[PDB]
């Protein structure tokens, strides 16, 4: 028995139709955002701030390119309902839109030499290569639940973390339209992690207690590995700024969200995940 | 990073047509919800029990093909992309295939009866022709013959598919089911670009092969087209049996088989005498 025609009037899990409706309904393209209105704001940023922004965004671009190419697609083979497969094909597509959005921003605000140098930086940056390597290794592996754990960490932790910068600038009245575009990405990202995290939880109920325990420990070890590598990434990128400690706190905040999307309890105490209300205000994240 | 996957750069297009198609397909985004299907409810009851059943089975068969294209087709063409932008384009195509398929359940929900719909599904799960065409195309998508996969997908989209759109487009000319006709038009606006683009990439791949290999593929194409053609003929003679339009369809099958070959860069296989179709039908497409 091959493939059967999909019946959307035979939903097997109401969650599938809900996410499908939310994701498709929230469709958008970078051309829909008035990025050109940030050109003046861009001009008020220091040379150091401009480089920082470009490198950060190139980093996010790498992550979504992977999610578009290997991430979302590697989960489609593990879907437990035909409707899930359709939703995953929408997620994969939107990851392409997300990756494409950064080029939109580069075309509108930056100079070619400046952007090309950033792409060269991303090719050699240690922490960025390592994080891409780690996740990608799980995506090509044989263990489905580990692919989902990696995917949620990529979306609810690694990604969100890069959103601090546009959100900070926006709180200062700079790059407000780019910030709007990032909130469009977050609106998708929040649902992606939630959904994939939910499917992970269901798969867990079908396993022995010994097996759930092995995955829980795996989850925490992978998180600490990605977390500490993200701290190093952060300390090098924001070396100047004076914003390193704010970003770190943001990392812990999102790591807790990644964990709960997986069905686990928050791991970082409030004293480590205290995000400036200005960032939270201007945010609208998970 | 390193030599692994690199961040995609849309300001360094490697083939202008990748950007063109990306913009056209994303610009044409749509969902079945955007179509006032309900406005077709009245006209729907003006059809006999035979017509309704026929229609529902045609749409079920089409639903089977898109589901395949969404999960197996488009996705298998991924590994064969020759530019990063093509990969992103194929992911959009794969997504829209899910929208196409989902659209049919919308039509059933808005105009049919549960028992009546589940009837078509059981039918497709055993209809000899349908299961065979699905078996043929799907066998290629699973293999490691990149160019054959492209030939197969072009046949699945520019030939196998359009062959079912005839019916809905007739009602359009007549006056019945006008909103469903708008929907089908949206699916066609996508389908036409899909065959064109993939046929385009197929031709790029051909120039890189030896002269003997191109002839080999060129022959393989005709051998696959005919096998699906006769299997399609058997499919048409059955469903449209009653009605008395089988001839109209047999003539439509040939029309789209020539257009599918053109997407691959080949010459027409059926002379205009066999691939002729009512001007009204064509005027709706």
Descriptive account of the structure:
2 copies of one chain form a homodimer. Helices cover 74% and strands 0% of the residues of chain A. The first copy, chain A, has 286 residues and is mainly α. Chain A has a single domain, classed as Ribonucleotide Reductase, subunit A (Orthogonal Bundle). The termini of chain A are far apart. In chain A, 49% of the residues are buried. Chains A and B meet through helix 1, helix 3, helix 4, helix 5 and helix 6 of A and helix 3, helix 4, helix 5 and helix 6 of B.
* Gross morphology of chain A: globular
Main sheet makeup of chain A: none
Assembly context of the chains: homodimer
For this structure, the CATH topology of chain A is Ribonucleotide Reductase, subunit A
What is the CATH superfamily of chain A? Ribonucleotide Reductase, subunit A
Keywords (chain A): Deoxyribonucleotide synthesis, Iron, Metal-binding, Oxidoreductase
Protein name (chain A): Ribonucleoside-diphosphate reductase 2 subunit beta
Catalytic activity (chain A): a 2'-deoxyribonucleoside 5'-diphosphate + [thioredoxin]-disulfide + H2O = a ribonucleoside 5'-diphosphate + [thioredoxin]-dithiol
GO cellular component, one term (chain A): ribonucleoside-diphosphate reductase complex
């Amino acid at each position: 028995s091959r493939i059967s025609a999909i019946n959307w009037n035979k939903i097997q899990d109401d969650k599938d139709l809900e996410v499908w409706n939310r994701l498709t309904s929230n469709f958008w393209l970078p051309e829909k955002v008035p990025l050109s209105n940030d050109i003046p704001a861009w001009q008020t940023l220091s040379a150091a701030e401009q480089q920082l922004t470009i490198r950060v965004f190139t980093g996010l671009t790498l992550l979504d390119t992977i999610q578009n190419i290997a991430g979302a697609p590697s989960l489609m083979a593990d879907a437990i309902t035909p409707h899930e497969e359709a939703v995953l094909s929408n997620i994969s597509f939107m990851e392409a839109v997300h990756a494409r959005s950064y080029s939109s921003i580069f075309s509108t605000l930056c100079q070619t030499k400046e952007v090309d140098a950033a792409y060269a930086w991303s090719e050699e940056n240690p922490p960025l290569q390592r994080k891409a390597q780690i996740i990608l290794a799980h995506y090509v592996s044989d263990e489905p639940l580990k692919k989902k754990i990696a995917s949620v960490f990529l979306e609810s932790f690694l990604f969100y973390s890069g959103f601090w910068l546009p959100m900070y600038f926006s709180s200062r009245g700079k790059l407000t339209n780019t910030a709007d575009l990032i909130r469009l990405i977050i609106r998708d990202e929040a649902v992606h992690g939630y959904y994939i995290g939910y499917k992970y939880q269901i798969a867990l109920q079908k396993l022995s207690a010994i097996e759930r325990e092995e995955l829980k420990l795996f989850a925490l070890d992978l998180l600490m590995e990605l977390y500490d590598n993200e701290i190093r990434y952060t300390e090098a990128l924001y070396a100047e700024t004076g914003w390193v400690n704010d970003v770190k706190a943001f990392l812990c905040y999102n790591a807790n969200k990644a964990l709960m999307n997986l069905g686990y309890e928050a791991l970082f105490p409030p004293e480590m995940a205290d995000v400036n209300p200005a960032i939270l205000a201007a945010l609208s994240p998970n």
